[model samples]
Target: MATFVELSTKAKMPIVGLGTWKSPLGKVKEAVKVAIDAGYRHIDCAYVYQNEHEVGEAIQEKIQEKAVKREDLFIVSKLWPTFFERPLVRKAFEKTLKDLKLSYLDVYLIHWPQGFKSGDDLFPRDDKGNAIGGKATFLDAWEAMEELVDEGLVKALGVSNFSHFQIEKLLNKPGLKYKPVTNQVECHPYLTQEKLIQYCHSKGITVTAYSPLGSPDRPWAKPEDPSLLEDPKIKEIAAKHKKTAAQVLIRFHIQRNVIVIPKSVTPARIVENIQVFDFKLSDEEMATILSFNRNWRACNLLQSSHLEDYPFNAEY
Candidate 1:
């Protein structure tokens, strides 16, 4: 099976991998080692997740066992908004590299357009409980990001959860040495993001679907929340392929030519997420899930005005 997908920038991105969004700190390394042993070559992580050290430990252990090499694995980390300054940008990459115990990263992303103060205060608060000021602007950060590519701290740089307005501004800028290779966002059966996905494709920017499973394990879940896993339509489609419901959601993205990252700490699920190449969804089934769009978004933490400090929330 082809494990990596080559990007326009000439870098290879793994087709499937383990997601560390909510993986407990205690079990993250074990999960990473388990995932690698199960044949996963890609691992998605971010500073906000606060577990790269653990994830890196697992990678080191696996490497000792001849399971995978650093070059053979695709490690993606994000540049948090707090470190957008021209001088600090490189430092952020270094920190991730240090945490991951790697010389370089396959891909690095502007975690969010938002920025925070440069100091240790990642999340600042006012007397009224609002986010503080001097957050990084998109344009300033993009400039720094371009320089990173030039310096080789990262093979490629891209944006995550960026809106069309933000992308247009980046495109309008002059002397862009390299265009963003991809735009990672929360796209799934419920939030197909048709216009955004199409726009990225038209611009030659790959679109990756995060939280494709409706993210049932979101840190904060209410008993009343709808579970995409339990969606009857998805179940029916899975029945056709004799696959699980999670596979149905992932396969939909695959057929649409979008990359998907589904988080699973389970050994069985790690194998299942990448096993989609074995089955094909009928055109009608794909269309059914396409229409399953109910404008549902699993990650709505941005709605809290208390987090107005986050630049992405303010713009959106």
Candidate 2:
């Protein structure tokens, strides 16, 4: 539970956290328990992850077992697109709190700058086959988020998967009681996100790296995809440090001061990922890993026609 990195607001955040995307209903709780047991004090849970109840239950077990207290943990969840309505936003937060059986979260994030027409679960599309709520305007919803913090419901507020343009718009906003603490994005060796990370850094906004191990097991990745841990380059680096490829990736992000959330349901991998705190990668090794970036992305908004010009079907 040692402090890994300090945020601009003087908030202490762990360098590594457990990602809970697509964690199965039955195994999600067990995974959280394992991650906590292995020294993870930060848990990245999300409405989109679809298993907060299980994750919360695991946290309760940890508390009861004296593994960790709720205050000692930094739990984060996102505000879903469907919950952008002024009245619905707090309800959404309450839903997560109720599901997790927690009084409040350490940090809450706006999942995306865009929104979805309520009840339209077909990603990128509304029932009318149009992306009705994909607009990038989040100021209104963001104001609601500020209200949540003002009401003592959230300790910090931030954005996720937000673009530089969106960030500028929010920054220019005035009278905001809560400034965006961080911007979480799809970051890994493949999708380096160097410019985005640097730009956010300059703005005094911390950057968090999601899918740090190239999202090794994300359902969004191609089924026959070559495992990042098994890649020759990654493996070579791992061998150099006598660490696994996963540890190599975790260490790489931490050195850059980027918060990394690597998902793992397996008990052994859970412990393996947290062991990064004990080692440091050399400057040359860090540069070599940075050079491995091929601008590869495992996550994309295929439903955004605005990005139809981009390569959506490139790898997957």
Candidate 3:
């Protein structure tokens, strides 16, 4: 409800943003338009989302209608693993900039710490269905991302799915130019990521929560998987405040000073999600929500878990 958090860099990122993962291109444009009209100033997207052009179209439409200016919205994207090499890094970012039809991005991130084989394919896999690794180090990718900021292609640089160890390595690089502005990770009551958040905040890096609603619509979700929104305790909390479970969950992240991006294609829900500024979650309710942490993760990359640098292997 505070609308935005002032970053260490003095950039104000909206406290609540619209997540673009798993959103089909057909509906993404409309969702973007509706969200902007509903007062959302931050839109989290990535090359991995594969729908930046559609998202761009929506942004263009809104601009044409004078609904919002380019500077009014924060657009974030990521560099995929396959583009980790020094040479490929710039090219991949340029492609995202072109696809988004924007002159500059608010923030660009290294999508993952692991490096996949360099090529056009996002997932460079072998005949056995295993991911192939590229020779480039993640540090090399970070260096190139720093250059983008210098060239005025992106305003800020960051990383995603990176563990505290991975981030520390980048931060300690001999001649590191830019510090990551944020670390986007899977977070919710089930996977609070408390240690990681504290570690990042200590280093002046913000933590953005993805899948705040447990990612119920993720493709790999099983029927019996625990549903964060349907939890009896969450429902009772929502009833006490006369808010929806999703709103309560979203507000939980805000109360922790963690940025949250919840993906929703439904116009009504998009409007409802940003309405959290009106109420406050008491200390008792916040603790009750924290009690639900079970170290559970919905986006565990099992397919690529074999990679030595796979992020989930880290404690935080």
Candidate 4:
């Protein structure tokens, strides 16, 4: 069973949500059903994923079949970089809601701190193959996000891929209405994120760990990249706990009080993922995994490096 982390909005966020990135539209509908059947309560989504319509269909199907009610599940979605700034924020939320076929989202995250050119192209790039940058700061987006909450379109607003410095800027913003409930960032053994996790928790904000299994199927990954699941040390740790490597990785976040969303389309893996509650990792085992941190981001946003306030430049 998945646990719940209470956000500032007083809503309970499922500690283990299903990741929808790279989950193809044709396959994601059934994957959602599989996850729901296996007792997943949260589904993390983004406009950039380009597959929310099918994910919405699965939610509707589950509702019709009495598998889960609308309120019983926590559906999360993110605003695309291009859509989050200025007058486009409301437009983007409407599109996501229409695509997801939901009245309101449990949590809406600013997909990434970096802003892209405001246009139809999801990733606006120039002839040099570099992402066209935009001046729309996340500080500007938060005001728009607060308006959405006022209108009852989104229950809570959080951030993704933001460094602690960016978060501090938002925290210190004058007349701040709503504090970000969670900071969703890349985390796994390699990117342990001890400082950032500790920072968010100290600020009364929770952390959500993405790429918990190191996102092995990410589009940018190469053959030479280290695989968290394939690491003999992790496998050895898994053997010690009588669990799979993925389970140990997922459990690593749970023990740290950080939310985790591990992506998987395969039915057996989805079933196996939530079976982690039955076992526990020893304190030394947890320390061993934490020591494996080399600060390697599985989904490193190198494309956004040129943008102003590009996150990950800070020490946090």
What are the per-model numbers of colliding residue pairs?
0, 0, 1, 0
Off by over 4 Å in 2: 119-136, 223-227, 305-316
Give per-residue CA lDDT, model 3, range 209-254, as digits (tens): 9999999989889988899999999999999999999999999999
The reply for model 4, stretches above 4 Å from the true place, is none
State the C-alpha lDDT per candidate: 0.78, 0.80, 0.91, 0.90
**Lowest summed lDDT over 10 consecutive residues: which window, candidate 1?**
307-316
TM per candidate comes to 0.91, 0.91, 0.97, 0.98
* Lowest summed lDDT window (length 10), candidate 4: 297-306
Task: Return the TM-score for candidate 1, rounded to 2 decimals.
Answer: 0.91
Ranking by TM-score: 4, 3, 1, 2
- Model 4 lDDT, full chain set: 0.90
Q: What is the Cα-based lDDT of residue 61 in candidate 2?
A: 93
Better of 2 and 3 by TM-score: 3
Query: lDDT: which is higher, 2 or 3?
Result: 3
Tens-digit per-residue lDDT, 129-149, candidate 4: 788887887877888999989
How much does each candidate deviate from the true structure in C-alpha RMSD?
A: 2.5, 3.4, 1.1, 1.0
Instruction: Report the Cα lDDT for residue 30, model 2.
Output: 94
